[PDB]
Amino acid sequence: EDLDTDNDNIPDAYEKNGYTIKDSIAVKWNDSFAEQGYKKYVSSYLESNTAGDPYTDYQKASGSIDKAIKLEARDPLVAAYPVVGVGMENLIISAYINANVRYYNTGTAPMYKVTPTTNLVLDGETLATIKAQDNQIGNNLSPNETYPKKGLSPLALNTMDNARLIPINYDQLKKLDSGKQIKLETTQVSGNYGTKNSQGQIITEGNSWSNYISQIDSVSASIILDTGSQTFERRVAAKEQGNPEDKTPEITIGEAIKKAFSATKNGELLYFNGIPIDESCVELIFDDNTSEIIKEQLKYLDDKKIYNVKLERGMNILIKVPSYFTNFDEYNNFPASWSNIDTKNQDGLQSVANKLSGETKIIIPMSKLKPYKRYVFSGYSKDPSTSNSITVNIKSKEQKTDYLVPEKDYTKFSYEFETTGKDSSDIEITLTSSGVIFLDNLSITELN
Amino acid sequence: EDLDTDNDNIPDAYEKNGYTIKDSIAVKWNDSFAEQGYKKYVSSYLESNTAGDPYTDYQKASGSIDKAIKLEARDPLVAAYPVVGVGMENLIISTSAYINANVRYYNTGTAPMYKVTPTTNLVLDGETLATIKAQDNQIGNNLSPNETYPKKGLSPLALNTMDNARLIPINYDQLKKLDSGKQIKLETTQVSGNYGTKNSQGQIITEGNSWSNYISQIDSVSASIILDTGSQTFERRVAAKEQGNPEDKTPEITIGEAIKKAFSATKNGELLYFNGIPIDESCVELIFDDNTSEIIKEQLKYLDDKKIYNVKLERGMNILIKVPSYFTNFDEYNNFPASWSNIDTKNQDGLQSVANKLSGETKIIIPMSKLKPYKRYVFSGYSKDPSTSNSITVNIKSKEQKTDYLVPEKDYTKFSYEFETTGKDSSDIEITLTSSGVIFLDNLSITELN
Amino acid sequence: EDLDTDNDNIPDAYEKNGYTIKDSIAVKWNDSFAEQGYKKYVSSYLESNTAGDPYTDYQKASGSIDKAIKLEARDPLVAAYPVVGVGMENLIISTSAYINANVRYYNTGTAPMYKVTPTTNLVLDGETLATIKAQDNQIGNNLSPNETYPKKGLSPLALNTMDNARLIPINYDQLKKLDSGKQIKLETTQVSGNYGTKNSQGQIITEGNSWSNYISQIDSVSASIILDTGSQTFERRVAAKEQGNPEDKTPEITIGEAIKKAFSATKNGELLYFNGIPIDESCVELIFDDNTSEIIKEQLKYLDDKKIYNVKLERGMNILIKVPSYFTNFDEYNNFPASWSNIDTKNQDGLQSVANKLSGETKIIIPMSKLKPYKRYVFSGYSKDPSTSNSITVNIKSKEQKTDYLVPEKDYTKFSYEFETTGKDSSDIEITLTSSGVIFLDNLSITELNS
Ligand SMILES: [Ca+2]
Ligand SMILES: [Ca+2]
Ligand SMILES: [Ca+2]
Ligand SMILES: [Ca+2]
Ligand SMILES: [Ca+2]
Ligand SMILES: [Ca+2]
Ligand SMILES: [Ca+2]
Ligand SMILES: [Ca+2]
Ligand SMILES: [Ca+2]
DSSP states (O other): OOOOSSOSSSOHHHHHSOEEEETTEEEEOOGGGTTTTOOOBOOOSSOSOSSSSSSOHHHHHHTOSOTTSOGGGGSSSBOOOOOEEEEEEEEEOOOOOEEEEEEEEOSSSOOEEEEEEEEEEEESEEEEEEEOOTTSOOSOOOTTOEESOTTSOOEEEOBOOOOBOOOOTTHHHHHHHHOOOOEEEEEEEEEEOOEEOTTSOEEOSSOOTHHHHHHHTTSEEEEEEEOSSOEEEEEEEOOOSSOTTOOOOOOBHHHHHHHHHTOEEETTEEESSSSBOOGGGSEEEEOHHHHHHHHHHHHTOSSOOGGGSBOOTTOEEEEEOOSEEEOSSSOBOOSSOOSSOOOOOSOSSSSOOEEEEEEEEEEOOSTTOOTTEEEEEEEEEEOSSOOOOEEEEEOSSSOEEEEEOOOSSOEEEEEEEEEOOTTSOOOEEEEEEEEEEEEEEEEEEEEO | OOOOSSOSSSOHHHHHSOEEEETTEEEEOOGGGGTTTOOOBOOOSSOSOSSOSSSOHHHHHHTOSOTTSOGGGOSTTBOOOOOEEEEEEEEEEEOOOEEEEEEEEEEOSSSOOEEEEEEEEEEEESEEEEEEEOOSSSOBSOOOTTOEESOTTSOOEEOOOOOOOOOOOOSSHHHHHHHHTOOOEEEEEEEEEEOOEEOSSSOEEOSSOBGGGGTTTTTTSEEEEEEEOSSSEEEEEEEOOOSSOTTOOOOOOBHHHHHHHHHOOEEETTEEESSSSBOSGGGSEEEEOHHHHHHHHHHHTTOSSOOGGGSBOOTTOEEEEEOOSEEEOSSSOBOOSSOOSSOOOOOSOSSSSOOEEEEEEEEEEOOSTTSOSSEEEEEEEEEEOSSOOOOEEEEEESSSOEEEEEOOOSSOEEEEEEEEEOOTTSOOOEEEEEEEEEEEEEEEEEEEEO | OOOOSSOSSSOHHHHSSOEEEETTEEEEOOGGGTTTTOOOBOOOTTOSSSSSSSSOHHHHHHTOSOTTSOGGGOSTTBOOOOOEEEEEEEEEEOOOOOEEEEEEEEEOSSSOEEEEOOEEEEEEESEEEEEEEOOGGGOEEEEOTTOOBSOTTSOOEEEOOOOOOOOOOOSHHHHHSSTTTOOOOEEEEEOOOBOOEEOTTSOEEOSSOOTTTTTTTTTTSOOEEEEEOSSOEEEEEBOOOOTTOTTOOOOOOBHHHHHHHHSOOEESSSOEESSSSBOOSTTSEEEEOHHHHHHHHHHHTTOSSOOSTTSBOOTTOOEEEEOOSEEEOSSSOBOOSSOOSSOOOOOSOSSSSOOEEEEEEEEEEOOGGGSOTTEEEEEEEEEEOSSOOOOEEEEEESSSOEEEEEOOOSSOEEEEEEEEEOOTTOOOOEEEEEEEEEEEEEEEEEEEEOO
16 A cells, blocks of 8 residues: 555555665566566665665665665665774884874775774783874775775874874883784774755765764674675664564575675575675684574574574674685686596585595695685585594694594585694695595685 | 643553554553563653653654664663763873873663763872863764773773873872872763754754753652673663652652563563573662662561562662672572582472471581682571571681571571671681571572672 | 733733642642642742743743752742852872862752853962863763762862963962961852753753853842751742832742742641751741841831741842751750750740759750860850749850850740850860749750851
8 A cells, every 4th residue: 555654755565565666666566577677675664764874765775875885785674884994004113103004995885084093002002092183084985995095005194183103111112022013903983974965965064974883783783795805794684583563574694695795696596796605605604692593593494504594683694705615516726636536426515526435635735825824624525324434634733633424414514723834844634435425515714 | 532731642541551652653552462572651641751861752662762772761761871981991100100091981871872071080099180081082982882982802992191281190199109009090970972863854963962961850850770790780760750749640660660671671470580590589689778778668567568579669769789699599590619518409388499498507618719809798598487496596707707696587588697708818718507406498699799 | 810911821810829730731729739739839920030040930830841950949939049169178289389179069059050160269368379260171061959079979070270281389478378377278259050941852952051141130039048957058049029119029928938938848837847857946046147137127026926937038138047056945856965954844834845944053064076176156045034033144164264144034035155165175165054043944056156
């Protein structure tokens, strides 16, 4: 019907079910609209700002907002949340200290009039707090862009009060003599956002992000997709547990990721920029509460998959893309081939598996490895016999010798090791199979 | 009807009785609505701000306020009021002598306080060295309730400015005082902050909405209730009607109902659980001031049940709830590292399921290395003696040896014993009690005090 | 009727007589409303701000103002006036040189002052040395009535800036005068603040407001009344009418009713219980100024009741009340550690229940542990002698020995024996009064007399 309660130019029955914006008006969603590119949106029929961002449901869905905002935030659930963090490009150092900084942005919305805050800490003790004065105020910061932009020298940082920074008493300098870098972390960032007024001009002076930070961060779940070379932070709204009046739609984790990161789902797989980010080909990291929630919710779920559980308010997810991944079907970035591998199989995770008769050993050079970094190998093993014992030997700073008991179906195993020293002993990784085993989706991922 | 005397979008007939918000329209409360998850809201029918907070009754009940405000303040009787404090995480002194400190603001209220500007006092022993207000660099943009600034995982910020010259204290006297062994303390006085109100356009504005306007109003028409689970401290303000004024129509509720409303704790029939932990009458120790203690003493003798959680709440009461660290009830919880002596679980006269049957004396050997020194602890429990012919004395070892007697009554009685524990390399703590005959015990606990 | 001349939502026919507020609408007063707890107010029907405070009569009567405003000020005849002072708690001087001051503001009025900002002189001996206005570090966001800043439980704030800068005893005279029995006392010339009014959007705004506008109006239509119990101090202002104006329709009330309205004291027939401590005329020693004393002396001869709590309150009167430190009416209170000698309670013609049937003289010794050194005390009581044949003389031993004589009247008469005590370890005070025959004495009072 045409009854409207929240007063956001979208009918209630259209909000509860699917709806799309056609020629600046909302129409009932029809499945035949998928081919043309029309996207189906659903949102609560009792609130205008569903995700908490300043733009309402009609403004976000109809594209009537600032053009710098990515298409990911045009979904009423994804919040236009700019994430800004100061990076320390170089250090210059009684003694006067200078630093080179360059702000980074990863959210779905730009931040105007950037004004960050920094902490000068070396070990626990913080020397001083710096609010960037009028010299370092970055006027514009588009998503996935830096201030200054690529191809420009980072701007200096000497303004503390026009007093300059200085470590005094020589005790901090004495501690630094042994070697302790001065960390630069961003406590907070102050910025504005764009709203078109009655006269049509974009006004970005009276606005402020700080009013909506405590609201966006309280009615949404953070989902981060890290590919190593770049990071993307998105927040997806979700309903409360014991609230009988919260009409925020419920979405699965996979659907939340697809909505947030604008992933092209081709049949069954999920792709971000041509790289698969589906459940079986990426290592996910959750905090303790999310891990407990998922563990509790898997038993009640028949399919028993991570990407089929509903999202909940307060969730935290990190999607760590593997550094090196192979599947024996369409991708193998490993510089060195594996040992005793047979592709003549049909019982794999998607198409084929690895038929091993004996043991598999892999040798990796140190050219493509980062010293003082932790790497984790993972894969899926299938053994219908359930009678073969498999052990793995890992050569590293600390020698590891562990055994595994594969099940009838595919099971994911995680083995953690740390490599220290670029010019160290060659890493030896060997796994032994009692009989014939099936392997698929072997991945190498760099961690903290 | 539709008579709206105070004009808060809720009819007075539904304000006097129970009302609930459904589709942003107030509806009459029904007993069947409880199963679907709805809650019954009651508020006065002569004013818009029943609890004195900047948001009205309809805004609080219908959730038309900032989403960072806890559901604990969605009740019209529970005010939205942030309690911001400052914690001196570290001290740095440099060579007259320049003093620097690391602070980290803490919020334990219900509503966020944007743009926090704390004012702090630098006191060493009685004499106050200086009074400092937060500068342009020590201001936190967002302080969500039950959070800090900087958030968890970041170093504390510095406070090395007096106005923008550094701190300039005295030269010799303060150093001589410090070298004696005293410690610089920090005592916050007042904090400045704002709150959001969705204007006509739809943009939340938090510039002129100072929290300081609604502090003297909130603290005057509310009964302060404070919780302390040891780690996570909670403080709340609950509205209470005036005593001798008939024109004040604020609803009156019991202390237990006030606690359940303020802290949103689940109640499974009769027992009350906060997060699965018991904070009911016998499961926690209540602390009052003089006025509340006298009022409760006068009111209790008029109550047949003799229950603290059934005393009508009044304006200005101060109630502190301190959850004991060590709690054993012989039913589902026993956190004491050392097993007790002469304890029997075969009973049916307990407060909830069973009690403790003692034949002789009860002795416990509690390790002290697991107990922090330089603190004060209170031993509490309930004793029941139908015979009323047993003399009980307690043997407690501490810094000063103490021994007290007890005369149990027919029913269960709560007894409190006070002692001081100091010194890490000190004598082990021993607690022993002797019973003349067979006695019934329940809910034995050890609680930390000031 | 509905004749609302003053445009304050209360009819004139209701304002001239009594009116009570029920269900946010003013209704006429009937005596049956007393037992339910309602109160009757009277106000001038040509003015909205009858008392001079920024809140109108309807708002104050209905309680539609800031909730921190005291219940004592909901009466339209009592003005909401935050009397904010600054107290000296600790003084530090150490190197011209430097001297540090710790202060703690006090509020005693019926209204809270927001964003307080005092302006204090630091005098040495008559001569002024400096004038320090509070900076951004010395501003109290909230100062609720009967509550200080910093609130009780926290140490007082410092005072180390006249402009920023450091506060200095500039010349050597202030360096040498410290130890010669002198003072660095602090007195507040003025204080600043705001008040909270709700705008059309329901929000309380305290920015554009200021108490400085409503001071010369509140002080010029009122009658200052101060109460001093020796620990807590209250100051109130009660509206009154100008004598030479035929259009000031402000209702006229007596001093006793003014006290009852201002301090919310309860009157259960004959007892005026402020907070359980009686503040009746006989049970306290009043202290007036010159003008009020002359006014009462002139008016009393035209009144047959012969009481101070009956004289009509007039604009500009100043009244100070000092609750007696040591009082005993032989009925329900006696704070004297030692019982008085030669006491006979077998009587019924006392002021309230019984009197004292003295036969001879009376003597008692007051312990020195409860006397303020270097202070002037006052001993007073009522004396009745129907016989009118016994002369009363007293012998007092103190720092200076004094003898006083009294001439009793037919009915009760109040005597005063003003004396001075100095020194903690001084000579014991000898209290001795001699009566030739049988005399009646009542209400022995001991009130410290202000300088
Ligand atoms: Ca709608
Ligand atoms: Ca909507
Ligand atoms: Ca494969
Ligand atoms: Ca109403
Ligand atoms: Ca109401
Ligand atoms: Ca039990
Ligand atoms: Ca009138
Ligand atoms: Ca009037
Ligand atoms: Ca008497």
